[PDB]
Structures are given as C-alpha cells and as structure tokens.
Write an enzyme that holds these catalytic residues in place. Structure first.
Site, short mmCIF file in Angstrom:
data_model
loop_
_atom_site.label_atom_id
_atom_site.label_comp_id
_atom_site.label_asym_id
_atom_site.label_seq_id
_atom_site.Cartn_x
_atom_site.Cartn_y
_atom_site.Cartn_z
N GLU A 1 -9.29 10.16 4.26
CA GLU A 1 -9.19 9.13 5.63
C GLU A 1 -9.71 10.31 6.72
OE1 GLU A 1 -5.31 7.21 5.87
OE2 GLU A 1 -6.57 5.38 5.85
N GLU B 1 0.88 -1.11 0.06
CA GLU B 1 0.07 -0.12 0.04
C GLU B 1 0.90 1.40 0.08
OE1 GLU B 1 -2.69 0.06 3.48
OE2 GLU B 1 -3.58 1.89 2.54
NA NA Z 1 -5.08 4.03 6.74
NA NA Z 2 -4.90 1.77 4.39
#
Ligand code: NA
Ligand code: NA
Ligand SMILES: [Cl-]
Ligand SMILES: [Cl-]
Ligand code: NA
Ligand code: NA
Ligand code: NA
Ligand SMILES: [Zn+2]
Ligand SMILES: [Zn+2]
Ligand SMILES: [Zn+2]
Ligand SMILES: [Zn+2]
Length: 240
Positions: A215, A130
């Site tokens: 986020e 990621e």
């Molecule tokens: Na995260």
């Molecule tokens: Na993530």
C-alpha cells in the site's frame, strides 16, 4: 518471460499470470491514475514497482496496492494448486513465505491482505474479515482502526494488533514489531486462531485469497517481491 504492466487506475486492473497460474500479479492501482509500472518475471513470480512516485498525505486510503496473490481477488482467480476457497475451521495447514525489497524513502506498508467471506465465491467486496500482516512500513502510515494490543506473541513473532470496522467487513492488522523485509513459514492457521479469539474473524467464513504487496501513499519506486509462496491444505492423502 519478463513483462511490464503500467495499467492506470483507478478503474482498470492489470493482472499477470505467473508460475503456471499458481499466482497472479496485479497492478491494482485502485485509488489513483498516477503512473505506476510493475516489471514481473512470469517464471519466478518476482516483481518490482519499476516506476512510481505517488504524492499525497499519509492519512486515509493509500493510492494503490500492487500485489501478488493465490486465490480470488474480486472474481479474478488463480487456477493451479489453489486450496481456496475453504472454510477457516476446515483448514489443515496454512503457511506462507515472502521476501521483499524495500527503499528508505516515501510512505508505504509492506503487507499481506487476506480476505474472508460468508460464501465461497463473490464477484466483489468480501463481507467477512480483511486480515493484514504488515512486515514493515515507513513514512508515518498506520493501519485501519485502533491499536488494541501491543507486543503480543502470535505464530512465533511479536506484533502490535489494530482492529477496525469497514462498511461491510471487519479488519484486523498484525504489525510485525520490529519490522523486517521478509518472513518465512508464517503459520496463517495460528494467525486465524488469534484473530478469531480477538473477535475479528468468524471461522465459518471461507478464506478467498492470500495477497501480498505494498500500500503506497508516497513514492513507491523500487519496492519489490523476490519470492512468495502460499500453501493451504485440506482433505486426506490419496494416490492412483
Ligand atoms: Na488499507
Ligand atoms: Na484494505
Ligand atoms: Cl473502526
Ligand atoms: Cl508454491
Ligand atoms: Na507450486
Ligand atoms: Na490521501
Ligand atoms: Na498452527
Ligand atoms: Zn483490486
Ligand atoms: Zn520474528
Ligand atoms: Zn526472517
Ligand atoms: Zn523474522
């Protein structure tokens, strides 16, 4: 051409095709059932978090990651001009641009989330790397893992680098320093080379997608995406 999607998490994802299905916008409220609505222009791909007021601490996982992407998220794939999946080592070029709208309240990041995987497709959690790219953040939130570099120059910008280990994948986060509300013509091939040099990316992995969004731990209303583009190239010139 404007749609509003409030699909509640944590188990449902509301996904809207935009720009002829070159991109998709997802509610992706993966860690909350609190009200979250996106308003999405399907002609331009612009979107806004039109309703949100998350509460909770600024540590641990965020509540949600509403985002736009090109490629495949958990088997939900775009279908026009994709260029992924592709083995990292075979990428000719990879460039992206993102212009955002931010609000001086709450606790969130403004971040790319880029997934790699050992095989070209998966129905679920990628197993490679990621790569997060934080344009900005506020409210005390920090990336996964540990800060391992400070003020490094990569792909024409200055970053702090955070590296961590998740249950079945590695994470590397590039934190733009200082933060900003947009980035233009970011060379992801350069980011991938750096991430490989730092030991976080296996370049035999397939690149699955390039996502961008927020986020959110606290607040979230009025965050948005004005414009977003991803171009990943391969192969040779050929006309009929
Ligand atoms: Na995260
Ligand atoms: Na993530
Ligand atoms: Cl870790
Ligand atoms: Cl485009
Ligand atoms: Na296009
Ligand atoms: Na929390
Ligand atoms: Na490059
Ligand atoms: Zn998801
Ligand atoms: Zn810069
Ligand atoms: Zn700029
Ligand atoms: Zn800049």
């Amino acid at each position: 051409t404007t749609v509003t999607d409030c699909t509640p998490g944590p188990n449902q994802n509301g996904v809207t095709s935009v720009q002829g299905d070159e991109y998709r916008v997802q509610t992706n409220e993966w860690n909350s059932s609190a009200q979250q609505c996106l308003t999405i222009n399907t002609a331009t791909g612009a979107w806004t978090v039109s309703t949100a007021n998350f509460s909770g601490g600024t540590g641990g996982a965020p509540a949600t990651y509403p985002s736009i992407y090109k490629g495949c998220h958990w088997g939900n794939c775009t279908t026009k001009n994709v260029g992924m999946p592709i083995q990292i080592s075979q990428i000719g070029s990879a460039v992206t641009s993102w212009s955002t709208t931010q609000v001086s309240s709450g606790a969130y990041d403004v971040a790319y989330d880029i997934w790699t995987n050992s095989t070209p497709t998966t129905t679920g959690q990628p197993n490679g790397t990621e790569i997060m790219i934080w344009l900005n953040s506020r409210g005390g939130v920090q990336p996964f893992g540990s800060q391992t570099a400070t003020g490094v120059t990569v792909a024409g910008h200055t970053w702090n680098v955070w590296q961590g280990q998740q249950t079945s994948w590695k994470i590397i986060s590039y934190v733009l320093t200082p933060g900003a509300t947009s980035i233009s013509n970011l060379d992801l091939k350069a980011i991938f080379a750096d991430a490989a040099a730092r030991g976080s990316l296996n370049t035999s992995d397939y690149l699955l997608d390039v996502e961008a969004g927020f986020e959110i731990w606290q607040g979230g209303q009025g965050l948005g995406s004005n414009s977003f583009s991803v171009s990943v190239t391969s192969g040779s010139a050929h006309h009929h």
